[PDB]
RNA sequence: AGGGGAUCGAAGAUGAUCAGAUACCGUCGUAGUCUUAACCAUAAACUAUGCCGACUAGGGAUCGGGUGGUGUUUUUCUUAUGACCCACUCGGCACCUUACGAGAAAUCAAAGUCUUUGGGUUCUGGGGGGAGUAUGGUCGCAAGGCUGAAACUUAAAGGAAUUG
């Protein structure tokens, strides 16, 4: 059974970008996927995407750019205590220059640079770069 | 963009349909592959005409771009195309290869038949599989006169053609040899059929 | 591929107990816990005698 | 000995362990899939004549029937001359029969 | 078992390729033209070149051969392929009536061009 | 690809594939350069001017070099009514 | 003596391609030995090891000597070459030739802000060969090379100052260890970054411009 | 423990071969083979590949439905079913061709989406022997299952491929 809807979305994107595609169809759909994709949309990893509304659940279609490399997920949403973000950002990303570890918290759904300014942290969802 | 002139000659539509260029492509279907216009009854397809004549002019524009003429290679192992390639080599500078390719031609500098070209033109991807696959080792583009049966391994700019036999090989090289000379060459005007002849290509009696 | 082992947020118990079983398949761990050095090994589990 | 063939004894697929059948020569038990089934039709009179019987006989036309004997051979027995003959590595793959 | 060797056929190809003139049928005249140009040490090997070169002249009057066909032989085709026996008429115009195309091919003309000659068949 | 204030550090600022937007490596022997001529009024061709493309060896081996060329050509204006958006 | 074959060989002898970039940018082959000697002056040319290898014969065996050699300088170029001749010292001559033909660039960076010149890898790269995976992994200033002595010589020729490693597998096989690391160091140019997203004009190659001077007239 | 008991048949008799043959070959041959009530719970119980879920590549066959075709026939006249053909579609047993991926390699469209490592979850393993033995439980009328050690010995045992 599809226990993680968020994992199915980012899995389908990786197989498309590997083959050399410019469009992906994610079926299950959610609020959290739309919040996750809009962070990628700001930093230039993904172009435009449009939500098809079946009178039922949802269906998303994305436009790939040719910039992505990997878009991963970490399923057991571990708790993070601001100072311990240095462990996760070092391992999951390459280099200290750029990359994003997309996490969730009581403010909203931030990247690790955005969350550092506010002095705020919580659970983790996934990453890019 | 384009000269707003080469809009497919209405007289040349008679030459294509008489030679059976757009009356086949077999039942079998590789799935690239949008060069079609519906299926005829009893296991026969129909190739679109406007798509072919556009791509032949596109192929001529790539051949015209190279500065040194004696460079673009024409290849044919199939016995029908052997006569057509020899004519193309005579009109404009283009070293031909008839029959066997001899493996290690583009690679391996010891060989007597050592080419080092910047463009390859092929008749059949099926029979000339050695020519297309081995050309990838030293960064060479390809042009293929394919039909809907043959594969697309390293095949750039594939002109849709009819590889059943006889006529359409002779006609497509005749139109290529014309369009190469139209853009930088002998002919100062596109009008007047030009002669020469299509039947100077073709298969002969043994 | 879930890699066999339980990757749950509340898996704690099974993760700890599975390894106390698998720890017994190592000679240095097995001989330290059971203590054959005292009961065997002619010396009294010592350097010199 | 690693993996030799993919299909092996062949047709037991989407199916449990099947009925066996006895060989002709050895009287040895072997599966019906892994059987080597030749079908040998023979003229009931031997072709070395064949005229000599029909010359002296009664009636015109004459039926002159044929026996329809289906045979089975337990692999090792078939390597003695029967439908096998050991093959090369890539020659194994040809499922198309020789001749016809 | 008189199979001629490779070193005989090395000379037999090299001599006939360049010097197609000075080669006419018989042994004795062509034998005098082997020692003419080349510098062979022995008599046996010298005369054995004359044997196989003269044998190729018997076949050359009954068509060509693969690998041994140069200078005159490429030109001795050649008009036959260049100025072909055909063409009387065009040919392949609309000599036999005016295009016997199919139903689907007739419909294909309407989208692209406008009007060609059509004797449309029902298939 | 940058440093403090003065100049750009690095060499070989590499070519990206026109179809996929993927970096073409130095030893990737298979990559190609399609140079297409610039036509003028009533035949002709402008000498020393091209509409250049570049394809990676990855997609060329796959089989979608021909389909990718007609997509690029129709947008630049080197073709008419060949490659369809909807299919 | 010199005397070139092929179009690029004649082009370098005239003296138009400087050193080097125009070969690597446009992905041109380099089959001639004499090109890299003309372009790059500084080359080492250091031998790693020599294995006698046996093939079985009906009455004896055939001793043949493999020769692993590394090539580079101290800026950002490295190479590798293996060859198996029956002469021992002659195989080193053959090994140095082949390694020059497969010389390949490297992309360096930071490592924690710019300030001055770069002296380590930009991104975390890796390469596999057989069953030996290598992983690197930049460092800060003043850490030095942290790898096996065999791998250390390959990194010294590259001009990389500071880098960590994490080899995993049967790493004693010195051919597969270096050849796996050669993919990891060669895969630096390939991984996209925020810097390389900006679009460039597609330039004409040396072969297109200088067509008439090359080729035998 | 009952019934049945034709054929083949461990034990066993009994002819040859053999230096010996109580082994293969042959002639017979008890139990067993079949069933009715109980038991036993193991096999190369092998696709030597744990289940549920996505996504990635083409190609025709086939077994079951379900669609449409003035299609072909059946012919009792249109029939109307059926049975054949052409295209399409869900589910299933399988195959072919390529690897861009994976792998130590044989090979694999899953053994792919893993140093760019994280979809959910059960089970088993940690050099070779001693050993599936000792001992103690527990289960069976028995045969034996399930559970399951160490002292002590040793530098190799092994997998896939290449030459001879
Ligand atoms: Zn048998």
Q: Which of residues 25-54 of B touch strand H (CB under 7 A)?
A: 28-31
3-state secondary structure G26-45: CCCCCCCCHHHHHHCCCCCC
Give the count of beta carbons closer than 10 Å to the beta carbon of residue B157: 21
Distance between Cα D31 and ligand 1 center (Å): 12
G96, G72 contact by CB (below 8 A): no
Q: Do F26 and G205 touch (CB under 8 A)?
A: no
CA distance A2 to A6: 10
Question: For residue D74, how far is its CA from the centre of ligand 1 (angstroms)?
Answer: 4
E114: closest chain B residue by CA: B10
Domain made up of G1-105: CATH architecture: 2-Layer Sandwich (3.30)
* CB proximity B48 to F under 8 Å: no
Pick out the residues of the known binding site of D for Mg(2+): 1, 9, 34
Please name the member of A20, A65, A67 whose beta carbon is closest to the beta carbon of F59: A20
Q: Which of B19, B49, B198 sits opposite E112 (nearest CB)?
A: B49
- Measured distance CA(A90)–CA(A88) in Å, rounded: 5
**CB atoms near residue A41 (< 10 Å):** 14
Determine, for residues A98 and G110 on separate chains, whether the beta-carbon distance falls below 8 Å.
Answer: no
Answer whether D49's CB lies under 8 Å from D43's CB: no
Resolution value in angstroms:
3.6
Angle at A109 between CA A107 and CA A110, to 5 degrees: 90
Contact B146, B163 (CB under 8 A): yes
**How far, in Å, CA of G89 to CA of A100, rounded?**
53
**Short-list B125, B129, B153, B157, CA closest to B143:** B157
Kindly state the tokens that stand for F4.
């403090």
SS3 of B75-95: the string is: EECCCCHHHHHHHHHHHCCCC
C1' of H47 to CA of B61 (Å): 56
Q: What residues of F are in contact with residue G208 (Cβ under 8 Å)?
A: 35
- Contact check, Cβ <8 Å, F14/G208: no
Q: Give A1-68's CATH code, choosing from 3.30.1370.30, 1.10.630.10, 2.10.109.10, 3.90.470.20.
A: 3.30.1370.30
Length of chain F: 87
Q: How far apart are CA A96 and CA A90, in angstroms?
A: 7
Q: How far is the CA of D19 from the C1' of H2 (A)?
A: 31
CB count within 10 Å of CB E112 equals 16
Give which of G8, G31, G210, G217 to mutate to test B binding, by max B Cβ within 10 Å: G31
CB within 8 Å of G170: residues ≥ 6 apart = G130, G131, G132, G176
CATH number of the domain that residue D37 is part of: 3.30.1740.20
CA nearest A128 in G: which residue? G193
Q: State how far Cα F47 lies from the chain centre.
A: 20
G195-200's contacts with Cβ under 8 Å and 24+ in sequence apart are G195/F1, G195/F2, G196/F1, G196/F13, G196/F14, G196/F16, G196/F23, G197/A44, G197/A67, G199/F16, G200/F13, G200/F15, G200/F16
CB-based contact F43 B3, cutoff 8 Å: yes
Report H helices in chain D.
51-56
Q: Which of E104, E116, E117 has its CB closest to that of B40?
A: E104
Q: Which of B68, B138, B139 sits opposite G212 (nearest CB)?
A: B68
Residue G124 to residue A69, Cβ atoms within 8 A:
no
- The CATH code of the domain at B12-206 is 3.40.50.10490
Q: Which pair of structure tokens corresponds to residue G112?
A: 């924690």
Q: Which of G125, G123, G95 is nearest to G108 (CA)?
A: G123
In CATH terms, the fold of domain G106-199 is Ribosomal Protein S5; domain 2 (3.30.230)
- F37 contacts B61 by C-beta, under 8 angstroms: yes
Cβ atoms < 10 Å from Cβ of G100 = 22
At least 3 CB pairs under 8 A between chains C and E: no
> Which CATH number does the domain housing residue F73 bear?
3.30.1230.20
Stated in angstroms, how far is A84 CA from H81 C1'?
77
Q: Angle G174-186/G149-158 helices, nearest 10 degrees?
A: 30
Give the residue carrying structure tokens 């080359």. Answer: G43
Nucleotides of H under 7 A from a protein CB: 43, 47-48, 50-60, 92-97, 100-101, 103-108, 111-127, 150-152, 159-164
User: Where in chain G is CATH 3.30.160.20?
Assistant: 1-105
Strands (E), B59-153: 73-76, 96-98, 120-122, 142-144
Angle between helix B167-182 and helix B49-64 axes, rounded to 10 deg = 50
Q: Using CB atoms, pick whichever of F12, F29, F52 lies closest to residue G189.
A: F12
Say if residue D97 is exposed, middle or buried (CB neighbours under 10 Å; 0-12, 13-18, 19+). exposed
Structural domain tally of chain D?
1
For residues B199 and E87, the answer to whether their CB atoms sit within 8 Å is: yes
Counting beta carbons within 10 angstroms of the beta carbon of residue D84, is it exposed (0 to 12), middle (13 to 18) or buried (19 or more)?
middle
| Residue G55 Cβ under 7 A from any strand H atom | yes
Which residues of chain A lie closer than 8 angstroms to F58, CB-CB?
20
Q: At what angle do helices E6-18 and E43-60 cross, to 10 degrees?
A: 60
Please tell me whether any atom of strand H lies within 7 Å of the Cβ of A47. no
* CATH fold label, A69-129: Dna Ligase; domain 1 (3.30.1490)
CB G48 within 8 A of CB G178: yes
Chain C environment of A77 (Cβ under 8 Å): 9
In chain G, CATH 3.30.230.10 covers 106-199
How many other CB atoms sit within 10 Å of the CB of residue E109? Answer: 18
D9 C-alpha vs ligand 1 centroid, how far in Å?
16
Residue matched to tokens 């630049």: F76
Residues 9-48 of C with CB under 7 A from strand H: 11, 14, 18, 22, 25-27, 30-31, 34, 36, 40-41
Nucleotide showing the shortest C1' distance to residue G133 CA: H115
Residue D86 and residue G196: Cα distance in Å, rounded? 60
The nt closest to C26 (CA vs C1′) is H126
Which residues on chain A are in Cβ contact (under 8 Å) with F19?
20
Question: Nearest CB to G6: which of B67, B116, B118?
Answer: B116
Burial status of residue D52 (CB atoms within 10 A of its CB: 0-12, 13-18, 19 or more)? exposed
Provide the CA C27 to C1' H128 distance, Å, integer: 15
Measured between alpha carbons, how far is B17 from B29 in angstroms, rounded to an integer?
A: 22
Rounded Cα–Cα distance for residues D49 and D45 (Å): 8
Query: Where are any strands of DSSP class E within G73-164?
Result: 77-85, 104-105, 125-128, 132-136
Q: In what order do the strands lie in the sheet with G46-57?
A: G46-57, G60-72, G77-85, G104-105
CB–CB of B64 and F37 under 8 A? Answer: yes
Q: Which of B28, B26, B29, B20 is nearest to B49 (CA)?
A: B20
Q: Report the number of distinct structural domains present in chain F.
A: 1
C-alpha dihedral (A71, A72, A78, A80), degrees to nearest 10: -40
Does residue F15 reach within 7 angstroms of strand H, measured from its CB? no
Q: Cβ B67–G212 below 8 Å, yes or no?
A: yes
Cβ <8 Å between A98 and G194:
yes
Solved using: cryo-EM
Q: Of how many residues is chain G composed?
A: 217
Measured distance CA(D99)–CA(D96) in Å, rounded = 9
- Chain B environment of G28 (Cβ under 8 Å): 139
- Strand H neighbours among A 61-120, CB < 7 A: 69-70, 72-76, 91-92, 94
Give the start-to-end residue ranges of the domains of chain A.
Answer: 1-68, 69-129
Q: Classify domain E1-61 at the CATH topology level.
A: Diphtheria Toxin Repressor; domain 2 (1.10.60)
């Amino acid at each position: 059974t599809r226990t993680s809807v968020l994992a199915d979305a980012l899995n389908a994107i990786n197989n498309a970008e590997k083959t050399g595609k410019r469009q992906v169809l994610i079926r299950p759909s959610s609020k959290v996927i739309i919040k996750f994709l809009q962070v990628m949309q700001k930093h230039g990893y993904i172009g435009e995407f449009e939500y098809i509304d079946d009178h039922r659940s949802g269906k998303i279609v994305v436009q790939l750019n040719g910039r992505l490399n990997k878009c991963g997920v970490i399923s057991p949403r571990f708790n993070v205590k601001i100072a311990d973000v240095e462990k996760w950002t070092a391992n999951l990303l390459p280099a200290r220059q750029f990359g994003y570890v997309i996490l969730t918290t009581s403010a909203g759904i931030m990247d690790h640079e955005e969350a550092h300014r506010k002095h705020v942290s919580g659970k983790i969802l996934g990453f890019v770069y | 963009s384009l000269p707003s002139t080469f809009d497919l000659t209405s007289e040349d539509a008679q030459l294509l349909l008489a030679a059976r260029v757009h009356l086949g492509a077999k039942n079998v279907q590789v799935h690239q592959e949008p060069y079609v216009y519906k299926a005829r009854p009893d296991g026969v397809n129909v190739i679109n005409v406007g798509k072919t004549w556009e791509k032949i002019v596109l192929a001529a524009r790539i051949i015209a771009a190279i500065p040194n003429p004696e460079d673009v290679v024409a290849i044919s192992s199939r016995t029908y195309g052997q006569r057509a390639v020899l004519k193309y080599a005579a009109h404009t500078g283009a070293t031909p290869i008839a029959g066997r390719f001899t493996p290690g031609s583009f690679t391996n500098y010891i060989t007597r038949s050592f080419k080092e070209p910047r463009l390859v033109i092929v008749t059949d991807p099926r029979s000339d599989a050695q020519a297309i696959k081995e050309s990838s080792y030293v960064n060479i583009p390809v042009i293929a006169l394919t039909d809907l049966d043959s594969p697309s391994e390293y095949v750039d700019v594939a002109i849709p053609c009819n590889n059943r036999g006889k006529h359409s090989i002779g006609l497509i090289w005749y139109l290529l040899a014309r369009e190469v000379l139209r853009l930088r060459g002998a002919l100062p005007d596109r009008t007047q059929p030009w002669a020469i002849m299509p039947d100077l290509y073709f298969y002969r009696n043994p | 591929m879930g890699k066999g082992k339980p990757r749950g947020l509340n898996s704690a118990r099974k993760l700890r107990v599975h390894r106390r079983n698998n720890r017994w398949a190592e000679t240095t761990y097995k001989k330290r816990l059971l203590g054959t050095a005292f009961k065997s090994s002619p010396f009294g589990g010592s350097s010199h005698a | 000995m690693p993996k030799k063939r993919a299909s092996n004894g062949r047709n037991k697929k989407g199916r449990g362990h099947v009925k066996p059948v006895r060989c002709v020569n050895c009287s040895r038990s072997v599966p019906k899939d892994k059987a080597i089934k030749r079908m040998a039709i023979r003229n009931i009179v031997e072709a070395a004549a064949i005229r000599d019987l029909s010359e002296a006989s009664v009636y015109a036309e004459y039926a002159l029937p044929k026996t329809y004997n289906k045979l089975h051979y337990c692999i090792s027995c078939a390597i003695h001359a029967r439908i096998v003959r050991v093959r090369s590595r890539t020659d194994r793959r040809i499922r198309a029969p020789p001749q016809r | 078992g008189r199979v001629r060797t490779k070193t005989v056929k090395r000379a037999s190809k090299a001599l006939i390729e360049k010097y197609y003139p000075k080669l006419t049928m018989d042994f004795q005249t062509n034998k005098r033209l082997c020692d003419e140009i080349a510098t062979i040490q022995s008599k046996r090997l010298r005369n054995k070149i004359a044997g196989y070169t003269t044998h190729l002249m018997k076949r050359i009057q009954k068509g060509p051969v693969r690998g041994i066909s140069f200078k005159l032989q490429e030109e001795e085709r050649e008009r036959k392929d260049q100025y072909v026996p055909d063409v009387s008429a065009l040919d392949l115009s609309h000599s036999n009536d005016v295009l016997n195309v199919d139903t689907q091919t007739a419909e294909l003309v309407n989208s692209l061009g406008l009007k060609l000659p059509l004797s449309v068949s029902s298939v | 690809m940058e440093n403090d204030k003065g100049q750009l550090v690095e060499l070989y600022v590499p070519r990206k594939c026109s179809a996929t937007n993927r970096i073409i490596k130095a030893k990737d022997h298979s990559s190609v350069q399609i140079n297409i001529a610039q036509v003028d009024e009533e035949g002709r061709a402008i000498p020393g001017e091209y509409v250049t493309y570049a394809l990676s060896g990855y997609i060329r081996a796959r089989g979608e070099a021909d389909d990718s060329l007609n997509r690029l050509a129709q947008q630049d204006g080197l073709l008419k009514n060949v490659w369809s958006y909807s299919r | 003596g010199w005397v070139p074959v092929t179009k690029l060989g004649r082009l370098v002898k005239a003296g138009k391609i400087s050193s080097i970039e125009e070969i690597f940018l446009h992905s041109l082959p380099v089959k001639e030995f004499q090109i890299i000697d003309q372009l790059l002056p500084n080359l080492k040319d250091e031998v790693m090891n020599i294995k006698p290898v046996q093939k079985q014969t009906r009455a004896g065996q055939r001793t043949r000597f493999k020769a692993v050699v590394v090539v580079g300088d101290s800026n950002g170029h490295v190479g590798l070459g293996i060859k198996t001749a029956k002469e021992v010292a002659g195989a080193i001559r053959a090994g140095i030739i082949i390694a020059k033909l497969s010389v390949i660039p490297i992309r360096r960076g930071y490592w924690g802000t710019n300030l001055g010149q770069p002296h380590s890898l930009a991104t975390k790269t890796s390469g596999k060969c057989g069953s030996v995976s290598v992983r690197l992994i930049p460092a800060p200033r003043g850490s030095g090379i942290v790898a096996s002595p065999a791998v250390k010589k390959l990194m010294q020729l590259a001009g990389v100052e500071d880098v960590y490693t994490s080899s995993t597998g049967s790493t004693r096989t010195l051919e597969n260890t270096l050849k796996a690391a050669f993919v990891a160091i060669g895969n630096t140019y390939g991984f996209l970054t925020p810097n390389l997203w900006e679009v460039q004009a597609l330039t004409p190659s040396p072969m297109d411009v200088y067509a008439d001077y090359a080729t035998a007239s």
